[PDB]
Structures are given as structure tokens and as C-alpha cells.
Design a protein around this ligand. Structure first.
Ligand SMILES: O=C1CN[C@H](c2cc3ccccc3[nH]2)CN1
Length: 168
């Protein structure tokens, strides 16, 4: 069982921790709580192989730049999830890209673009534009709805396949 280190990134309001709880113990929370450092270490069966996923929900607040740039080199699987409730999240992607690539020292990284909050009637970002920006990054775009548990498995299964492709 290989341990995969995952780092969740995104703006405040997207509910990163909520997305984790809905996957780990499969529970949804409406309340928001400022997370700092933890480890949602759960084993998942992918392609018939049970792997250990070390999902770490990082602080969405810009008050730990030192700690952030510290072990950012250990960030294997970056979880970039954006919401349609905020259009700025579509711009924040570029900021994250420059931050990640800089510490990764590589332009090639197994990552996917997932859009959540598809249970909201307000769509500030369309599918065409979403896929377009994803293509410019060389990453696949998938729609995910944590609230109704849709596309969660689909997006996760493909992600692992991409990572293994980069590894071997
Ligand atoms: O108790 C803990 C706290 N989080 C640690 C962690 C470090 C790390 C680096 C990169 C991606 C995910 C990561 N998770 C693991 N165990």
C-alpha cells in the first residue's frame, strides 16, 4: 500500500473540509471551520489496488506563507477544486499554478480540474470556458457535486490513473 500525499487548495467558501468529510466518513457539514493541519488518511481501492490517501486540508487564509512554502515540495496530489459561486476562483487557478510549478520545478504534473457546487442555480462559469482553461494547462476537467455525491468517484478514479501514468 503506497501512501499518496494530497493537498487541497482553494478559496474560502468552497468548503474544502466539507468535500473531505463527504468522502472520508461520507458526511456533509454546513458550518465552516478554519482548518490548519490534519490528515484525512483513508485507504481507497483503485484499479483493484488499495492505496492510502493522505488528504491534507491546508489553510485557505494567507497567514502561513512560511509553512506553506516549506513542505510544499512534498505535495504530491494537488486537489484544485473551484466553485461556480465565485468567479474569482477561476482566476485564482493561475496564482496557484505559478506557486505550485515554482516549487515543483516541473511543468508536467498529474492533476485534474474539478468544478464543484453544481447544486447551486448560479453558474458564473460555463463548461466550455472551464474546459478551455483546463486544456491550456494540459489537465482534464470534470464536474463534481459533493452535496448530492455525484462525480466524486468518477473524478477520483481518473485522477489516480493520471498520477500512476506520470510515475511509471
Ligand atoms: O498528521 C499528518 C498531518 N498531515 C501530514 C501531511 C503532510 C503532507 C504533505 C503533502 C501532502 C499531504 C500531506 N499530509 C500527514 N500526517
Amino acid at each position: 500500500m503506497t501512501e499518496y500525499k494530497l493537498v487541497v487548495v482553494g478559496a474560502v467558501g468552497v468548503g474544502k473540509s466539507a468535500l473531505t468529510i463527504q468522502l472520508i466518513q461520507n458526511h456533509f457539514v454546513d458550518e465552516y471551520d478554519p482548518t490548519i493541519e490534519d490528515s484525512y488518511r483513508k485507504q481507497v481501492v483503485i484499479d483493484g489496488e488499495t492505496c492510502l490517501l493522505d488528504i491534507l486540508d491546508t489553510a485557505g487564509q494567507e497567514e502561513y506563507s512560511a509553512m506553506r512554502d516549506q513542505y510544499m515540495r512534498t505535495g504530491e496530489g494537488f486537489l484544485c477544486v473551484f466553485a461556480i459561486n465565485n468567479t474569482k476562483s477561476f482566476e485564482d487557478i493561475h496564482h496557484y499554478r505559478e506557486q505550485i510549478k515554482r516549487v515543483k520545478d516541473s511543468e508536467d504534473v498529474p492533476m485534474v480540474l474539478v468544478g464543484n457546487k453544481s447544486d447551486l442555480p448560479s453558474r458564473t462559469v460555463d463548461t466550455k470556458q472551464a474546459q478551455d482553461l483546463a486544456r491550456s494547462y494540459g489537465i482534464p476537467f470534470i464536474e463534481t457535486s459533493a452535496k448530492t455525491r455525484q462525480g466524486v468517484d468518477d473524478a477520483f478514479y481518473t485522477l489516480v490513473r493520471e498520477i500512476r501514468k506520470h510515475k511509471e
